[PDB]
Design an enzyme around this catalytic site. Structure first.
Site, PDB file in Angstrom:
ATOM      1  N   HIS A  21       0.846  -1.187   0.000  1.00 15.00           N
ATOM      2  CA  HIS A  21       0.000   0.000   0.000  1.00 15.00           C
ATOM      3  C   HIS A  21       0.896   1.258   0.000  1.00 15.00           C
ATOM      4  CE1 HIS A  21      -3.842   2.217   1.362  1.00 15.00           C
ATOM      5  NE2 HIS A  21      -2.900   3.129   1.208  1.00 15.00           N
ATOM      6  N   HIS A  23       1.942   5.061  -2.632  1.00 17.35           N
ATOM      7  CA  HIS A  23       1.491   6.000  -3.654  1.00 17.35           C
ATOM      8  C   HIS A  23       2.703   6.685  -4.257  1.00 17.35           C
ATOM      9  CE1 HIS A  23      -2.687   5.866  -2.237  1.00 17.35           C
ATOM     10  NE2 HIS A  23      -2.182   5.862  -1.015  1.00 17.35           N
ATOM     11  N   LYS A 135      -8.889  -1.017  -5.414  1.00 17.78           N
ATOM     12  CA  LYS A 135      -8.877  -0.240  -4.156  1.00 17.78           C
ATOM     13  C   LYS A 135     -10.243   0.343  -3.921  1.00 17.78           C
ATOM     14  CE  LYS A 135      -7.619   2.575  -0.741  1.00 17.78           C
ATOM     15  NZ  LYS A 135      -6.484   3.466  -0.971  1.00 17.78           N
ATOM     16  N   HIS A 167      -9.470   1.090   2.072  1.00 18.13           N
ATOM     17  CA  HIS A 167      -9.257   2.145   3.052  1.00 18.13           C
ATOM     18  C   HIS A 167     -10.325   1.940   4.143  1.00 18.13           C
ATOM     19  CE1 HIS A 167      -8.633   6.435   4.391  1.00 18.13           C
ATOM     20  NE2 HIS A 167      -9.876   6.243   4.807  1.00 18.13           N
ATOM     21  N   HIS A 196      -5.285   0.002   6.507  1.00 16.79           N
ATOM     22  CA  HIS A 196      -5.112   0.941   7.635  1.00 16.79           C
ATOM     23  C   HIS A 196      -5.474   0.291   8.989  1.00 16.79           C
ATOM     24  CE1 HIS A 196      -4.397   3.562   4.415  1.00 16.79           C
ATOM     25  NE2 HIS A 196      -5.567   4.172   4.324  1.00 16.79           N
ATOM     26  N   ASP A 199      -4.353   1.274  12.578  1.00 12.48           N
ATOM     27  CA  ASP A 199      -4.932   2.479  13.208  1.00 12.48           C
ATOM     28  C   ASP A 199      -5.673   2.142  14.497  1.00 12.48           C
ATOM     29  OD1 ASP A 199      -3.890   4.067  11.247  1.00 12.48           O
ATOM     30  OD2 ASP A 199      -5.803   4.555  10.272  1.00 12.48           O
ATOM     31  N   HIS A 220       0.207   1.660   7.825  1.00 12.11           N
ATOM     32  CA  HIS A 220       0.383   3.049   8.244  1.00 12.11           C
ATOM     33  C   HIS A 220       1.547   3.187   9.219  1.00 12.11           C
ATOM     34  CE1 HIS A 220      -3.652   5.485   7.703  1.00 12.11           C
ATOM     35  NE2 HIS A 220      -2.897   5.492   6.612  1.00 12.11           N
ATOM     36  N   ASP A 267       2.427   3.230   3.438  1.00 11.98           N
ATOM     37  CA  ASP A 267       1.488   4.194   2.868  1.00 11.98           C
ATOM     38  C   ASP A 267       2.191   5.540   2.685  1.00 11.98           C
ATOM     39  OD1 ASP A 267      -0.845   5.320   1.794  1.00 11.98           O
ATOM     40  OD2 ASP A 267      -1.762   5.664   3.763  1.00 11.98           O
TER      41      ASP A 267
HETATM   42 CO   LIG Z   1      -6.439   5.249   2.723  1.00 15.33          CO
HETATM   43 CO   LIG Z   2      -3.101   5.139   0.711  1.00 18.04          CO
END
Ligand SMILES: [Co+2]
Ligand SMILES: [Co+2]
Ligand SMILES: CCOP(=O)(O)OCC
Ligand SMILES: [Co+2]
Ligand SMILES: [Co+2]
Lengths: 330, 330
Positions: A21, A23, A135, A167, A196, A199, A220, A267
């Site tokens: 994950h 970008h 996604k 997400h 995620h 979290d 994350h 991420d």
């Molecule tokens: Co996200």
């Molecule tokens: Co992301």
């Protein structure tokens, strides 16, 4: 037996150490081409990504999955350019995140299914680059439109074998409803990563999903506002739990017996325009290692906590390949 | 001053009969390039637009202003292509409408000013095509973000002499707040068209704006769901006021002495993806004349009602040139 990347099909062996994950640039549809100077320039952005990807590669990374959708302003031509320059495989994504424009929000489940299938089976835009992941996103209970997105994602996945990744707002225990919707379409949990998930500190929420065969996206890890708590926007986006607390959830799940279900990532991004103007700089201040944070910091940390290197290689190499290689039941 | 079109700057002598509020394709940022099949194909869309523009040309039209913004999915390369093919001048737009993605909505007034200025002074994307108008929008009382956009539009207009044109909820008299915000920035009303103004019957409201120097955009004339009143989606979009009722507002404004403040248009399109899937087909069934509706239907209607051809030429040729030709005070 092959995984689609921005440079064509690769084998499972070729994928090697995979960040699941990430970008290149978190933006919005059309924005990078309309306002490249937002990022300094397109050239500056590309150069920054190449530097970061080369550092990641030096640290052991061989593949990243860029989970940028249409509405994250995914630009697959930029992905192909930086993948080539850095010599790191990049898997591109279809699906929708939580910023779809009207031309998307007004579409039916059948239409969204057609669109996700196009990007997987035909190509993205006119590039011939095909997506290798889908996604989706919720932030709390799904809106009617997000239900259609999740159903369309399940259907695209059921027709192609390409997995789905999500997400969540983990604090909302979103994965439970996501799972309910996916299973209502008959999607195998083996084809789904609940993202995620680091979290939350609620381990029983994670173990219960893992017990059902879901993959758990602990993606994350370097996201923390420790040291800049009085920065409201940064605190809101990153949270105030330490990277060490997030990483320890990896050991927790391993100890419970779910090493096979774990996916880890940073991420990270190299450009970011959908939030406060300089959020990318603040993030870089938090984690100078960028995408090399997992291999450089998290893996040694877990080894130090007693996790065998072989378990960690299983998590960073074996799990991602099993997840990405197209199938209806992994 | 010269008027920016997608084929380069033209002189006032060149503009001829001008439609000041039109669209080649009403869509969303990045949408045309990601999902051209939604329109059948890009090629099909282009062909439809060329046919339409040629029909308009044959009826007397020489220039259209395409008020599609970034978030209406404006594709200036498509505009350039069909402008060349149909030999009709097309003025492109900057600004923002009702569907800004996060990468826009997170932006400051200064940042938006810079973006609008880029599209006017530098060019759109990497095409070198420069906008000749700024489009903004409210639907009732301005949102805080919309306030920023109107101020940024005022500033970009004040730096360039390029005029501003607006979407309104006319029955709510949005024009008054827009005017107030524009004047608080020192923008001359002679640089502002208050659009969708044929949506209201309140001539007191329209003449008070016209007397202050605003252009009054009577640009929705063929928009009517008469004959399909039980089509909820079409009725909501098009309304149920007849085209004759809208057109008679033109005569009304003329009869009160405001002929120089009037700008008339169809608000037509050749493609439409931001609403229900086949709304374009429904629209073409309402108005087979497309952009030729003004010249073929409205002008003769007004002639029959006693309006002299010379007043009509003043509205359709003289007013748009004066509006478009860059200046800070017209
Ligand atoms: Co996200
Ligand atoms: Co992301
Ligand atoms: C893209 C469409 O924009 P609009 O003129 O606000 O509505 C047209 C029917
Ligand atoms: Co409008
Ligand atoms: Co319009």
């Amino acid at each position: 037996d092959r995984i689609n990347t921005v440079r064509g099909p690769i084998t499972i062996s070729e994928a090697g150490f995979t960040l699941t994950h990430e970008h290149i640039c978190g933006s919005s549809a059309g924005f990078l081409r309309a306002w490249p100077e937002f990022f300094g320039s397109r050239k500056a952005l590309a150069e920054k990504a190449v530097r970061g990807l080369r550092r990641a590669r030096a640290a052991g990374v061989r593949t990243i999955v860029d989970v940028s959708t249409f509405d994250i302003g995914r630009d697959v031509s930029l992905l192909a350019e930086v993948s080539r320059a850095a010599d790191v495989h990049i898997v591109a994504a279809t699906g929708l995140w939580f910023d779809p424009p009207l031309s998307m929000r007004l579409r039916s489940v059948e239409e969204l299914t057609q669109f996700f299938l196009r990007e997987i089976q035909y190509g993205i835009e006119d590039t011939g680059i095909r997506a290798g992941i889908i996604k989706v996103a919720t932030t709390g209970k799904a809106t009617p439109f997000q239900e259609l997105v999740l159903k369309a994602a399940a259907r695209a996945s059921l027709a192609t074998g390409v997995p789905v990744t999500t997400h969540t707002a983990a604090s909302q225990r979103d994965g439970e409803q996501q799972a309910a919707i996916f299973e209502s379409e008959g999607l195998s949990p083996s084809r789904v990563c609940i993202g995620h998930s680091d979290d939350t500190d609620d381990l029983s929420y994670l173990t219960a999903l893992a017990a059902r065969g879901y993959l758990i996206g602990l993606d994350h890890i370097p996201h923390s506002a420790i040291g800049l708590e009085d920065n409201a926007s940064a605190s809101a986006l990153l949270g105030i739990r330490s990277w060490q607390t997030r990483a320890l959830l990896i050991k927790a799940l391993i100890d419970q017996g779910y090493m096979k279900q774990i996916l880890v990532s940073n991420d990270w991004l190299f450009g970011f325009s959908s939030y406060v103007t300089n959020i990318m700089d603040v993030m870089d201040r938090v984690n100078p290692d960028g995408m090399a944070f997992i291999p450089l910091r998290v893996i040694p940390f877990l080894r130090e906590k007693g996790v065998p290197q072989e378990t960690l290689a299983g998590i960073t190499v074996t799990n991602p390949a099993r997840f990405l290689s197209p199938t209806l039941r992994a």
